[PDB]
Structure 1
Amino acid sequence: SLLHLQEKNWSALLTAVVIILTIAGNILVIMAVSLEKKLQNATNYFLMSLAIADMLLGFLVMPVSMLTILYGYRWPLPSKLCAVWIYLDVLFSTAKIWHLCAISLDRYVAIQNPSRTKAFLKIIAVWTISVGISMPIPVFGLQDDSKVFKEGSCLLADDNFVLIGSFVSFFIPLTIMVITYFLTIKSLQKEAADLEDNWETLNDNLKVIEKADNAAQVKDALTKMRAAALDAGDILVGQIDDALKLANEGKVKEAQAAAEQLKTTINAYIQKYGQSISNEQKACKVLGIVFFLFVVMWCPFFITNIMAVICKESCNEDVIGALLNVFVWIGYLNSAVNPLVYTLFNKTYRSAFSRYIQCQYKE
């Protein structure tokens, strides 16, 4: 006679904290994006879908996790719900990883570029891929309980599902997330670097023009400025082309005062396009924490679920089984942390959460 409610209640209280931090956290992220105009951007659109994935984890997967801790890991529900529960748990965690891959990729491509719908295609695509990858679990598990039960404990026993699922559903977008992140940071380092190349060579020619005697030195300098005006792309190129014909007739003192009028347009277009990459670099790092903390907090669960399969004979399967029941809750907590990052590291989400708690919904 199994399925017995126990005194495993030290652990079972802590689990209710992680459930309510997940559900309320991620509801605020869904509420913020829907109601805040400042958040209506593609990355924020993914970060909602992630928070929907986290909330569905909190409503459906995480309570049943807690339920089995209350029954000493003997599965207390109907046996055909085990594979269902294993499916949603892997669904949501596969939808989170392929999202983080989709953000890191999309932005790199956006950093090599000059819609709600273009964003909402891409989310559905990732969910479609995630549902498709996670599909063997019910298809084969509901047919054979050997894959989803180990001694009345509902867990994914199938060692091939655990291996090939780990390297298809996880390592293929982890690789692509860390590469597209690293190049995105190298893209935005080069572009800050090119901007101060073109700060110094416009500032260099404004020294050259206001020293010049002849139409030669003004013309060469202005020609070089227009070259390194084209190197930053509109607004100011025609204004140099204004002042380029003044040098060409020989109207020198007249062209030198025109170039002083270019000087306000420059410092306008520099500090505005240089607060631009200052911002993307801030955000790319906040995504990088969301990325990093996903990986780190699941890493203990993820290595140990593979040592369960590598050292099947060599290692104590009781303590391995004993560790995973901890190491899954470290990765579950991750569902609560995405919203705290956005509180700490974005003013926009923070002011939004701040109003929603005071029940005040007009921006």
Structure 2
Amino acid sequence: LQEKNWSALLTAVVIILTIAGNILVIMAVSLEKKLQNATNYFLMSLAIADMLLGFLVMPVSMLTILYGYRWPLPSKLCAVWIYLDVLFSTAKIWHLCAISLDRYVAIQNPSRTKAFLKIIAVWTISVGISMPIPVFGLQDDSKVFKEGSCLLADDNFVLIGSFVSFFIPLTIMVITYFLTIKSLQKEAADLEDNWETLNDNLKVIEKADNAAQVKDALTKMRAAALDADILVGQIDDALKLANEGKVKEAQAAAEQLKTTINAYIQKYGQSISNEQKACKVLGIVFFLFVVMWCPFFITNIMAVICKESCNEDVIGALLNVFVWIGYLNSAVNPLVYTLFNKTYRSAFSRYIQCQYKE
């Protein structure tokens, strides 16, 4: 029965922060026009997953702490509760994989509908992957009950579920995240190199005596312009003057290029610094999810490995606490957004003040 547990107070705090914080994310992305990009649409869908886990899954997990982990509800609600908990968590890990993969492809290939199609793809994969839990668990209580505790009792569901639904999207997430960091370092390197070629050839053109030196340096500025359209024509115009022997006039046009170079370099240069700042925030989201679920995932796999060897009473007691470190991850993504994005922080600040006009 009640059993007077004190855990309820702590668990309720986690539930409220989860619900309130993730509502603030869904409100920020629905309302604030500066957050209408594909990454932030994935972060809204991830917040729905986190909100639904706070509403449907977490109160029932608190409820079972209050009955000594004797399952208080009707018995066929056990497999439905486990299904939802695995679904919302599987959908969290395939979303973070999807962001990581989509940001990587978006560098190499330079729509709201396209994002929504991928979001719905991620949910449909999560609903399908998690589907053996109620299909087999509702026909056999031995798979979802252990000593009248509702938990995923089938060892083979836990191994193959952990590998297929939690290890392979973790693998893809960590590879595409590392390759994204290498991509943006190469892009900032290539733009330092193009800046050096433009700046060296401006100094050659201003020292120049003859039409050969200006035509040589403007041709090499054109090649360097072709790595980072407006300048290419502006270069060609000066090249034509140099071709007809108008050296001084071509030199005048090169200083006219200088103003356009300072403009286009710093614009491309500030867009790389934005992407790397954004990658770092997503990396903290990614880092916290792996770390806060790590004690539960490995213990649950170590339970299966030392099945008769280990104190399964102790193991089960750790899994009951380690599931709450992972539930606490639902509360942190909104905080991360406040700490590292002015747009979220200001949006949240306004919504707490009940003020919804952008």
- On whether the aligned pair clears a TM of 0.5, the verdict is yes
**What residue in structure 1 maps to residue 23 of structure 2?**
27
Per-residue deviation, residues 317-361 of structure 1 (Å, max 9, x unmatched): 000000000000000000000000001001001100000011110
Report deviation, 1:6. 3.5
CA distance in 2: counterparts of 1:20 and 1:77, whole angstroms: 22
Alignment partner of 1:316 out of 308, 311, 331: 311
CA distance in 1: counterparts of 2:227 and 2:2, whole angstroms: 70
Per-residue deviation, residues 138-158 of structure 1 (Å, max 9, x unmatched): 000000000000000000010
User: Which 4+ stretches in 1 moved above 4 angstroms?
Assistant: none
**What residue in structure 2 maps to residue 203 of structure 1?**
199
CA distance in 2: counterparts of 1:175 and 1:250, whole angstroms: 60
CA distance in 2: counterparts of 1:10 and 1:70, whole angstroms: 9
Q: Is the contact made by 2:3 and 2:67 (CA closer than 8 Å) also made in structure 1?
A: no
CA distance in 1: counterparts of 2:316 and 2:357, whole angstroms: 50
Q: Is the contact made by 2:91 and 2:126 (CA closer than 8 Å) also made in structure 1?
A: yes
CA distance in 1: counterparts of 2:248 and 2:177, whole angstroms: 50
Q: Is the contact made by 1:8 and 1:69 (CA closer than 8 Å) also made in structure 2?
A: no
Q: Secondary structure at the match of 2:267?
A: helix
**What residue in structure 2 maps to residue 230 of structure 1?**
226
CA distance in 2: counterparts of 1:24 and 1:81, whole angstroms: 26
CA distance in 2: counterparts of 1:235 and 1:83, whole angstroms: 62
**What residue in structure 1 maps to residue 45 of structure 2?**
49
**What residue in structure 2 maps to residue 355 of structure 1?**
350
Report deviation, 1:8. 4.5
Aligned: 1:294 with 2:296: no
Q: Is the contact made by 1:87 and 1:135 (CA closer than 8 Å) also made in structure 2?
A: yes
Q: Is the contact made by 1:209 and 1:217 (CA closer than 8 Å) also made in structure 2?
A: yes
Superposed CA RMSD in Å reads: 0.6
Q: Is the contact made by 1:46 and 1:103 (CA closer than 8 Å) also made in structure 2?
A: yes
Report deviation, 1:203. 0.3
Q: Is the contact made by 1:6 and 1:71 (CA closer than 8 Å) also made in structure 2?
A: yes
- Structure 1 stretches of 5 or more lacking a match? none
CA distance in 2: counterparts of 1:68 and 1:359, whole angstroms: 36
CA 1:215 to 1:199, structure 2 compared with 1: closer, same or farther past 3 Å?
same
CA distance in 2: counterparts of 1:161 and 1:285, whole angstroms: 34
CA distance in 2: counterparts of 1:128 and 1:68, whole angstroms: 29
CA distance in 1: counterparts of 2:154 and 2:226, whole angstroms: 59
Q: Is the contact made by 1:223 and 1:244 (CA closer than 8 Å) also made in structure 2?
A: yes
CA distance in 1: counterparts of 2:210 and 2:237, whole angstroms: 18
CA distance in 1: counterparts of 2:3 and 2:140, whole angstroms: 32
Q: Is the contact made by 1:19 and 1:63 (CA closer than 8 Å) also made in structure 2?
A: yes
CA distance in 1: counterparts of 2:305 and 2:235, whole angstroms: 68
Q: Is the contact made by 1:30 and 1:48 (CA closer than 8 Å) also made in structure 2?
A: yes
The count of corresponding residues between Structure 1 and Structure 2 is 358
Report deviation, 1:235. 1.2
Report deviation, 1:114. 1.6
Q: Secondary structure at the match of 2:25?
A: helix
Q: Is the contact made by 1:188 and 1:277 (CA closer than 8 Å) also made in structure 2?
A: yes
Report deviation, 1:214. 0.5
CA distance in 1: counterparts of 2:146 and 2:93, whole angstroms: 27
Per-residue deviation, residues 78-116 of structure 1 (Å, max 9, x unmatched): 000000000000000000000000000001000112211
Report deviation, 1:316. 0.5
**What residue in structure 2 maps to residue 344 of structure 1?**
339
Q: Is the contact made by 1:8 and 1:72 (CA closer than 8 Å) also made in structure 2?
A: no
CA distance in 2: counterparts of 1:56 and 1:320, whole angstroms: 27
Q: Is the contact made by 1:105 and 1:177 (CA closer than 8 Å) also made in structure 2?
A: yes
- Structure 2 stretches of 5 or more lacking a match? none
Q: Secondary structure at the match of 1:200?
A: helix
Report deviation, 1:231. 1.3
Q: Is the contact made by 1:99 and 1:123 (CA closer than 8 Å) also made in structure 2?
A: yes
Report deviation, 1:9. 2.3
**What residue in structure 2 maps to residue 281 of structure 1?**
276
Report deviation, 1:314. 1.4
